[PDB]
Amino acid sequence: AKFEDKVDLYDDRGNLVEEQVPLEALSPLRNPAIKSIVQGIKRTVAVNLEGIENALKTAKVGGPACKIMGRELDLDIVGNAESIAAAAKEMIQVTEDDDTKVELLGGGKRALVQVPSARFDVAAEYSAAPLVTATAFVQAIINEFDVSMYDANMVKAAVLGRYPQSVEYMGANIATMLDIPQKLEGPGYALRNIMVNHVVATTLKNTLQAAALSTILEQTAMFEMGDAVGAFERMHLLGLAYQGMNADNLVFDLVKANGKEGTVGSVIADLVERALEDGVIKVEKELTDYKVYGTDDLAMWNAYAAAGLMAATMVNQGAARAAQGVSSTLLYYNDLIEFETGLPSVDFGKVEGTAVGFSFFSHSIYGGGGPGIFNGNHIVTRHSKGFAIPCVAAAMALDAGTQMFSPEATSGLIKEVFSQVDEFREPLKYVVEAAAEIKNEI
């Protein structure tokens, strides 16, 4: 092993599942469940057959409020969804009985599609998923109804929108969790451009699962970005484990102890006591009636602090059952813990900084929005390297209905399709079992 650290792994009810698992068994580079989740998200597409049908019958194609009078086509797509889906599958697959899926939902109104892995082996990136899916469904629909050459371009518009006049698939009736590569803030960012509401919807608002899926995506991106290479790798692995995988039951136990009456401040006090009990920090020197704490392990202090940050979000936004204050928790958990201890806050100030901007851009005229529309690729919330967005996912999971731009509003198509996939919906048990499987290979 490169690192000697071991962690105990728990389920989302706080029960011990695996003891003393090597840290690297949770690494995105090693853990086969993380690989399966990431590959799955790359290759999965939601197809709105009802939406395609309605766009065609009204000629409302090419984006908001657009319509071409005289171009209407009345096709019974939903009524013929089985045949269309089977025809599309024949085009999407590489070989019969490979890992292609095309599965109807909602009585034929939607389809879940998983494009075969073999197509991505010989692709540079991930756009084959929507593009292969789109043309397979365009062709299948044309063939189902013998749509004429003169009219077929309307089927194309109904499926993929204004592309390529627009750079995006503007008005498309397919959806993915990922967004187009051109919209990346930086190379390596693609797993960060996944809306918080999509993660929350997919995990059915289960708080710990939403946090886990978000942390998996964020910290996996940190590897793709090169941020978790060399000196920084252990910091990112310990963050993944303690903040998003409830390592050592620390998040769970902090929430248990602070859930009935607690505040951000009371979670801080318990976390600092635990860090001291476990030897992660110690008193370095004494000022007047003030103890200055130090650590010989900044990455582990950071990870403990990150666990407390997650617990503080769950306690504060959980008590309100309202997500908006997550921007405040992310700021003042970190501000308070520095002046409580004399140690640096989570991500060495970058969570606090992210929180400052996020607070501003969720309470002001200038941009942003509610917590659910942010993501790791958003200019407001890209700055912390994986330690902020998972708290936003937890907070939105806990929201009882205070948001206009809720997951129900923004993410219904994604919810219907992506929540079908067990590993997307409930990733934590899969990642924990996979860690157990490979523990002796580390």
Partner: protein
């Protein structure tokens, strides 16, 4: 009757228009031209003042060995030298673009839902009117909440304002009419009812930011500027905390969830934000042009007003400056809106269709394309052959290709009622023209036309799109003059023939039906003539804040 271009040809030349011979070289060179003479003198003055040589007729080759022609702006009696139709020299052309660039459409539907469902407050016609009075103070750059704010000079930003429209007549009539685009007044009955049915109970703002700001900055400024002042006016008018969590919902709604940009952003090689010309799809350009609601008994006039709008914007400003620059592409564009030439060819094609099929009654098939596009192409080319003065007028093959194919494509679409078969006719015209004269356009003119036939009906990712949704960023179309404005015309043609109130976006159609614009979008060619004569008054000038 005489061909529609005969008056223009008689004005331009000494010889009768059918004569094959003329006189060159003894015409006085640049001295034959009032405008070139103005330029020579101005160049001398410029160089003397700044100490660096500038315009000099003796550089390079000597202009005016042939006649330097006047051009008739089509549908007008105005004749001007071509330099007066250069976008740099024509304030009307500049203001057409500024009026598009500085406009965004922003819903109030999500905003009103935030107020009602999240804040728990009422929205009424009265609260909407109070909001509109507020935002018409704020939008040009003035304060409503903070102390010690410094503000834009109202006279510099007099062109900035906000209006609303809705399909619900009873709501529209209860809002102060100063702030309402009156669909029933601006549109004839059937068009008004179509448009109101599209909008329904929705309420939409048309926001125009100041020209002086749009010129200082860029198109991508518009929706941001709009949203800031919408946001401030929501705070002031609905009396909420001046910056609370719900404030972010108004921001997201105004900047993203219910905004309609005029143009979408462009990819890196031609990097640009929103509301730049390359992002404006052909169907939006046809809907911005307001010929449809005034000239609705003449589908040729409507279609060719759209062509003029697009030829100028897309070839002169967009391709000729944003994407290149210099002397640029004035006459590649003027070919499509001068001397009543495209008008002659297109009225011919419309008559052919009316006699053979009836408007909108031809089969939507390749047989129809082959028939109409071929016949109209041959008519147009015959005119250049029968009238040597015409051929010397539209001297560049590209100009001729665009004009002949525009007439062929529009005519085909008049017959089918479908823009896609119109587009197929445009490409067939190019192929026929190329074989007839053993030439077509400039070196790179027919990239998109050679790819064209195959991509008209394609359904593949970056190939397949109805013409209305295409624009200057459609891959094949991204580079070359003499196509984009003509495609906007073909997009318009079947809808004009059908009597449709709009081509692609009814909100865009309504948003430019507004007497408070600076440029008159109902009469684009009339405005180009006014600008050529130096009679157009643009917004955005700095005279008030500079020395007298």
């Amino acid at each position: 009757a005489d061909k529609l271009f005969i008056n223009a040809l008689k004005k331009k030349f000494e010889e009768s228009p059918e004569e094959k011979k003329t006189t060159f070289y003894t015409l006085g060179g640049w001295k034959q031209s009032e405008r070139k003479t103005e330029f020579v003198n101005a160049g001398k003055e410029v160089a003397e003042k700044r100490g660096i040589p500038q315009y000099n007729p003796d550089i390079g080759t000597p202009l005016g060995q042939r006649v330097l022609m006047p051009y008739q702006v089509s549908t007008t009696d105005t004749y001007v030298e071509g330099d007066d139709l250069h976008f740099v020299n024509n304030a009307a052309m500049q203001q057409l673009w500024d009026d598009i660039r500085r406009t965004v459409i922003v819903g109030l539907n999500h905003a009103h839902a935030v107020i009602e469902k999240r804040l728990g407050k009422e929205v009424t016609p009265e609260t909407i009117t109070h909001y509109l009075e507020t935002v018409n103070h704020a939008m040009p750059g003035a304060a409503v909440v903070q102390e010690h704010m410094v503000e834009t000079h109202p006279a510099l930003v007099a062109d900035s304002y906000v209006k609303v429209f809705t399909g619900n007549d009873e709501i529209a009539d209860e809002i102060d009419p100063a702030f309402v685009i009156d669909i029933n007044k601006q549109f004839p009955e059937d068009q008004a009812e179509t448009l109101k049915a599209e909008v329904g109970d929705g309420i939409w703002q048309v926001v125009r930011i100041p020209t002086i700001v749009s010129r200082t900055c860029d198109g991508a400024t518009t929706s941001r500027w709009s949203a800031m002042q919408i946001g401030m006016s929501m705070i002031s008018a609905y009396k909420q905390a001046a910056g609370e969590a719900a404030t972010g919902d108004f921001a997201y709604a105004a900047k993203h969830a219910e905004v309609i940009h005029m143009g979408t952003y462009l990819p890196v090689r031609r990097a640009r934000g929103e509301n730049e010309p390359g992002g404006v799809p052909f169907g939006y350009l046809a809907d911005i042009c307001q010929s449809s609601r005034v000239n609705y008994d003449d589908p040729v006039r409507v279609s060719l007003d759209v062509v003029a709008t697009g030829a100028m914007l897309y070839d002169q400003i967009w391709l000729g400056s944003y994407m290149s620059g210099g002397v640029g592409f004035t006459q590649y564009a003027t070919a499509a809106y001068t001397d009543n030439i495209l008008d002659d060819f297109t009225y011919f094609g419309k008559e052919y269709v009316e006699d053979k099929y009836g408007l909108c009654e031809a089969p939507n098939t390749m047989d129809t394309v082959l028939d109409i596009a071929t016949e109209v192409t041959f008519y147009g080319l015959e005119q250049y052959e029968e009238y040597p003065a015409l051929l010397e007028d539209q001297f560049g093959g590209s100009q001729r290709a665009a004009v002949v194919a525009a007439a062929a494509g529009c005519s085909t679409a008049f017959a089918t009622g479908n823009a896609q078969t119109g587009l197929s006719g445009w490409y067939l015209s190019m192929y026929l023209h190329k074989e007839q004269h053993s030439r077509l356009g400039f070196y790179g003119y027919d990239l998109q036309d050679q790819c064209g036939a195959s991509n008209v009906f394609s359904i593949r990712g970056d190939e397949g799109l109805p013409l209305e949704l295409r624009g200057p960023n459609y891959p094949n179309y991204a580079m070359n003059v003499g196509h984009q404005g003509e495609y906007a015309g073909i997009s318009q043609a079947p809808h004009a023939a059908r009597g449709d109130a709009f081509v692609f976006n009814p909100l865009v159609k309504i948003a430019f039906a507004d007497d408070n614009l600076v440029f008159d979008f109902t009469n684009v060619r009339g405005e180009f003539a006014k600008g050529a004569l130096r009679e157009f008054e643009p917004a955005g000038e700095r005279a008030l804040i500079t020395p007298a």
